[PDB]
DNA sequence: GTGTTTGAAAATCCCG
DNA sequence: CGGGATTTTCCTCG
RNA sequence: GGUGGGAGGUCUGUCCCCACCAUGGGGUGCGCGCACGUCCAAACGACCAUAUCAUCGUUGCCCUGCGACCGACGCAGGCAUGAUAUGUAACCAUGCAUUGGAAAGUGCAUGGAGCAGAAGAAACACAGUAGGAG
């Protein structure tokens, strides 16, 4: 009668929130402002063909760039030498196979450039971290020892991260995975037996709004014979008798079930679209960025002090005093600004983490109840061709719908694939 | 939106 | 001053 | 009684707290009152104070007056609207410094955090939010 289910899992991540002291939170954004100079710094390096950074050249002269001399430990040393901020972040965080070049910069490299020699790409069309896209994220290696969850809360451990003293506190400890052969072990059980791994990766990072978070990723070592190197499970809950379901898309219900149940599309956007376009039309006359009148004035003084310098530097000689160069600053936004700002990106947050809950409550009272689901396509660009749903689907997001409907169909080991959601689950079963 | 991934073991550095 | 904490090193990339 | 929100990992209601609207109208039943259920009325990312400004009749009115034309115009004014900045916000307990004879705040270190019902795979990369430079 809808019990609950402990099924294996190959990969894990559980999201938890930090709750660091103040001084935590500086060294954290001190090792992602490191993280994200490593970044351009190599990739800015990487364009001007230089062996300490770029391979070995094949016979025509092309040239990739081999990531084993951006984790090797003299590229660090030198980088070190050139500025010492980059020092302020692990070496695990950039060294290791989950860290910012042998990661991201392959990723970067494969997928942006299309895998492609330095000397015959650009630098316009390759993506950098600065203010449009911070680095907030710092991965690292920690043992079990490092994760002491708190005895009289079932929802609060202690971290603790190199370079880092305090034992950050952190909250949403899922106790419904187990560790052990059978996962009849909790996480303080697992860790005494030795039936963790020694090294777990852990992602810290910082949303769009002031929060910080920690992922701490389970994974199985190898596949060798059929018994995980790791093994970890959770426990899931599935209706008592399972049905065949078949799933059709309408307009103003976000899923309908053959059954006949049904599913009202929230669609939280436009029930708050009138405070979204305030809030907008409001910070577009604020004094920060966004504004036409700031993003302006700033590119302007900062063309001036360039120019300033420049006939500062080379027409007066830099002898001793010539003239006077004025720096002052390169202006910031205002209070005023800044409150309406965080206020804007906590609300898209709560409209996203609204969709993604009632879309994980959907998708789990779905996916218990169907032993064969049948929807109708995995991709939302080949249900546009009508474009009667695009005035809907523009808010209602169906990629995370069809993403966590996959993922949450196949830990049950559910295969994928009103009249009309019949019509289709009948097409499905004689196929 | 669409696609792809997810450590383990030594060599070296440093505070009660 | 020596065990533990941090750094490195592994492998494949046109 | 409603609306919006701040912290308790996420969603709904409740718990604690912050700022606002209502104490209205109507269509019908019963004996001016009670109203079975509603529909409209608001309140939508703070509120107060401080300066510095809307501008093509604006930013509405008072026209506070003045002047000329034949209801309309200009000049010198005042409030209220709106809109940009400075100080100021949102659960509980302890210690320190500082304001306070107190009552009670300020800043720091922290420490703790539900209740009922659902769930909880995260990150990165790329057409974009358009920029950042090395």
Partial sequence: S??????????????????????????????FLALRLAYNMTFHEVFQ?????????????????????????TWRKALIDQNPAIAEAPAAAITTNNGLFLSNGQKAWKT??????ANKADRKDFRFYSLSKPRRSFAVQIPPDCIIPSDTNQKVARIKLPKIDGAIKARGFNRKIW???????????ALAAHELSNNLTVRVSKDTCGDYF???????????????????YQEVRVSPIPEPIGLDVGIKDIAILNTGTKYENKQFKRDRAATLKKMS??????????????????????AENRALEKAQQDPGSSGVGPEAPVLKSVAQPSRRYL????????LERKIARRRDTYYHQVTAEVAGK???????????????????????????????????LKYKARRIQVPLVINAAKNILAIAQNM
């Fill in 214 to 232: 920690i992922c701490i990723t389970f994974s199985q070592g190898k596949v060798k014979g059929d018994k995980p190197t790791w093994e970890f």
């Fill in 281 to 302: 039309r409001q910070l577009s006359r604020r004094w920060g960025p966004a504004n036409s009148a700031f993003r302006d004035y700033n590119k302007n003084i900062r």
């Fill in 49 to 73: 063909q230089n062996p300490a950074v770029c391979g070995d050249p094949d016979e025509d002269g092309n040239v990739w760039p081999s990531y084993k001399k951006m984790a090797n430990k």
């Fill in 370 to 404: 169907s032993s064969l689901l049948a929807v109708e396509t995995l991709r939302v660009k080949n249900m546009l061709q009508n474009h009667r749903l695009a005035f809907a689907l523009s808010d209602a997001a169906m990629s995370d719908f069809i993403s966590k």
């Fill in 339 to 346: 409150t309406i700002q965080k206020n804007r990106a906590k």
């Fill in 112 to 117: 942006g450039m299309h895998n492609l020699p």
């Fill in 179 to 189: 560790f052990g052969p059978d996962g009849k072990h909790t996480y303080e059980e």
């Fill in 2 to 31: 809808l019990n609950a289910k402990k099924i294996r899992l190959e990969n894990y991540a559980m999201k938890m929130r930090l709750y660091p002291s103040p001084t935590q939170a500086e060294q954290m954004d001190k090792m």
